[PDB]
């Protein structure tokens, strides 16, 4: 029962998440089932992680095969899956300079690695955006632009200046010859799928290049083909110095990566960084399977097509509570005219849909890339009643 | 071939580990095979991670079953494996006060969670030991007591004082009413399996309790029954305020945990910390399987028996390069009379044994808890020739 599972959670878990309102028992594709047998269409993917949904045969087969071959070894030893995964990720980034890879376990750890690279430039000043989310460990939390989540743990690693997201002249004013790096999400996810103005990431590339700062693009949530290009920044024709990845990288298996291009790729020398589980064969095998499936099933182009039809379908409802839809591909925010997103998350759950109130007035969607068109169709048709019940 | 795998590594990986000398292809139990067909007895366990060796059927069964049931969901939803794992870990700690659990992906992240708990006490001073290792993210690196790995990333989060490990008077002098927490390994692993004097951990518990400081015991390397108790600190009959775990916790799958006891368990409130992959069903299922096998096969008590036989056998060699043997259970250090541990690591490798030069003069062993005594006996019989060749 849901109450027994919730009571067990409240007896033993730290309360840093609050208590989950539902307890899930199984999942298959984009459908999850709770402990009472109710099914839900998953439009959130565990917060953009389950790019291939649950029980994807290719991920299961890769993990099962690798566990029956060779498990964890540590990076005292070279192993095939991590090397192959690094080769594939470098090919997908497609930079015209030498690109090198560091594996870790999470998005916070990937940005901690990028934080450390920044230190090796000889500079200690960092710039990030207000409301950005880059992780919750002490270094990545310093980059995260959320004072209410940072103040309790101060002092944090320095020296970080935050600027308004998308504001070209604010960024230019904050970046100088002392700036080690600028961190940016190509779309701010956790804040409410906030899309920057047209030339903004290109401006960030030019500002950082002229001042000798690294440009670090955090693709933890925007990557893995979700926006219709493998990396969201590839829509903008720029090459950052560092890119970080996690969430969907392993199809659900914990893995993150920090890629560095050109001189940045050479900063880390032996003994200066590491992670015990980083690059382990089982999680790397899972990530390799995700990449294979994205390519063989054309899921990156499918995200662009479905995201475009989903945005138009929502906008065509003409619902007075919907101000606009934003995002790209299958990362979408439904921006509301009044702050009812939390209520709409609950009434959507009543209607059998899992969504996210990312902000008081924004519903975030990040469905599996394997989502059925009819599963999206049903959500759009149900949305007016979801919103009417919310208000 | 090994040469081809090393070339592929050098073309794509960042150089933070150097280039591994061995490329592994497969593993089974405590025997691994490299890409050239050479076999090795694994006395290091991927750095204390592979508590059950490779291809353990209980871990394979748990992971395959859980992947075919429910993968990642995020902590927006309650799921059974993480709740059950938290229940089992709390039972194993055996504290008399309420204990709560936070899951994450690594030992660094576990200590980052403990660092953040320390901040919520309203104090910002931290104490750790010289030569301690607590992780490489910015917060855990501040606690790590290794200047050459810290100074390139300065400034690190404050305010940490390091004291000599095992020195009661130095610790008493460093801990005052502004000290948020003391972090200690019960045996320093990375440093060279440095065992503290009798009574030290009990003194640390008394010092911290009197001064209002948290005692955080880092059991990432000493836990999972390796020393003959589930937590190494249980040998000394103390209960810390916070315990961190990782490495062997998942039998190879990436998972870590921060356990907090009594008032420390209530410091984290909703919204103040999190990790996307934390507590996910697949890794938690793996860890549950490890705990089941430890219990069903009596591997904790077995680690004590094998560690004593191993220690006695090494001491009985009377080899002039061996100064003493230290450690507990299956975390063992061979302290040498001259700094030839790196050479001995290589000659052990020539003889088909994987060991670790943890310091210039210490060979560290952390074999799978399923290692056969016969495999240990064979290493002892080979050690005189290994050490002769080393010098």
Author numbering:
A (entry chain A), B (entry chain B): 7 to 397
Original authors' sentences:
The arginine biosynthesis pathway consists of eight different enzymes ([Fig fig1]) all considered to be essential for *M. tuberculosis* growth *in vitro*. In this work, the ligandability of four enzymes of the pathway ArgB, ArgC, ArgD and ArgF is explored using a fragment-based approach. In conclusion, using a fragment-based approach, we have discovered inhibitors that bind to novel sites in ArgB and ArgF and to the active sites of ArgC and ArgD, which in case of ArgB show on target activity against *M. tuberculosis*.
While NMR608 was the only hit validated by all techniques the fragment library contained a compound with similar structure (NMR868) that had only a melting shift of 0.9 C and therefore wasn’t selected initially for further testing. Nevertheless, The orientation of the acid group is slightly different in NMR868 and it no longer interacts directly with arg142. For ArgD selectivity might be more difficult to achieve since many of the active site residues are conserved in comparison with the human cytoplasmic and mitochondrial enzymes.
